[PDB]
Design a protein around this ligand. Structure first.
Ligand SMILES: C[C@H]1O[C@@H](n2cnc3c(N)ncnc32)[C@H](O)[C@@H]1O
Ligand SMILES: C[C@H]1O[C@@H](n2cnc3c(N)ncnc32)[C@H](O)[C@@H]1O
Lengths: 248, 249
């Protein structure tokens, strides 16, 4: 009877989920609202996380403490990093990582600022397990959960469903050269602001996790934000959750 | 039972002195986060080892709220100098903290390259909801009475100045001096570290008084490399500070 936890950051990324639940009960603690109900007769909790790494981690931790979910699906919209992808495509996160984590080597003021010399700062993803330090350079999507989403690709009719790497940061990048550099360096499919943070907390609690992100925008093709993509993503996720539930 | 003071540090060196100060301890670990529950001057205190960075800090703080319901939060530890007036061993009391790592940029085509001077602070990362209604935050103010108390205790600190300042939190360790200078000039930062504003965000959501207290363990503005002894010194000051609050309870 442990629920599926489904997350979205903004109201537009959760309202379609909420509408799908039967016998809803709403809970708000701190800044974070949860709707507890059923899908196909099975317990599901929808979480509106708010935006960014701190919010995502708090909302995920609070859900672990309150609901003890059996798996977490983090979803919502993202911006394209891979030129092959277009608005409406859905990325299933083979892995996510904190793309915004940076360490730089000492340079005197005369040398100016050069972000291309910044290194990914992996300590931000380091955890402890039974008190012992465990390094992480990324968080893998649960591979069975990833595979399931890919196997359901043809049920999504508003773009392609592809595996990719999700770069999480407290950033919205619109400098195309920066997007290109991040893609070349980290092989990112897309950027957003929550996935690796929720994933970090899921790893700490040893709960299976998958990130599912629709491209609502990509400055690589001049495609501006389309809020309807967030609805289409939730529709896919409802179908996906119901498939999991059929198998329970 | 009395609601505890919650005292946080990210790394072992930032909490071992606090933990040694508690009486009648028990140690609790959930997920990746360890807590020591005991007493200082007979009053309940929980010491939290948060691990490093914004996600860890927020998780550790949230878990503490759920498990322990503290009456106030002191987030402490070490930091790197951004203000050239400050040196290793000086302590900054956070008049405010903010997510210095949060960046938004306007559209530029590839040929214009990358320009971080055009990456603006992205305030949505600090936006919260209060009873379901959106509340914007461009920073989190340290509880002003807590901040004031720390400043009033300045001459009890034996190893440097105690000053008010702005704490810039980011999942970053900057050693490009031109970038440190740019951050200082843009945001009036005293120091940088990796947790404060994230713990502050959670404390604001829960409406629990919060103060950040950071010692400079390093500053590349003066060629001063990391000294771990500063972390011990900071904890000593924090214990004195906590005992003063407790006397007032
Ligand atoms: C503001 C909300 O929008 C998502 N989001 C959608 N597109 C982007 C993008 N190009 N860059 C960063 N975040 C994005 C964030 O993950 C966040 O939750
Ligand atoms: C790695 C630990 O060290 C702290 N810390 C100490 N000095 C710095 C600095 N110059 N920059 C960023 N973080 C620093 C972080 O807050 C983190 O917890």
């Amino acid at each position: 009877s442990a629920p599926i936890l489904i997350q979205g950051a903004m109201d537009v990324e959760v309202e379609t989920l909420v509408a799908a639940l039967k016998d809803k009960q709403e809970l708000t603690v701190g800044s974070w609202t949860y709707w507890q109900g059923t899908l196909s007769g099975y317990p599901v909790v929808v979480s509106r996380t708010e935006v960014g790494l701190a919010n995502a981690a708090a909302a995920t931790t609070l859900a672990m403490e309150r609901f003890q979910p059996r798996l977490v699906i983090n979803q919502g919209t993202a911006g394209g990093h891979d030129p092959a992808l277009h608005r409406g495509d859905i990325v299933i996160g083979t892995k996510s990582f904190n793309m915004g984590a940076y360490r730089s080597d000492l340079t005197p003021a005369e040398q100016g600022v050069d972000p291309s010399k910044w290194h990914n700062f992996e300590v931000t993803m380091r955890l402890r397990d039974n008190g012992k330090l465990v390094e992480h350079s990324s968080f893998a999507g649960d591979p069975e959960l990833v595979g399931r989403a890919l196997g359901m690709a043809d049920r999504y009719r508003h773009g392609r469903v592809v595996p990719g790497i999700i770069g999480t940061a407290d950033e919205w990048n619109r400098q195309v050269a920066r997007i290109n550099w991040l893609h070349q360096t980290y092989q990112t499919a897309a950027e957003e602001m929550e996935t690796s943070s929720a994933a970090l907390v899921a790893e700490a609690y040893k709960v299976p996790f998958v990130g599912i992100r629709v491209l609502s925008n990509t400055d690589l093709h001049g495609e501006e934000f389309d809020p309807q993509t967030a609805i289409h993503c939730q529709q896919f996720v409802i179908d996906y959750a119901k498939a999991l539930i059929n198998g329970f």
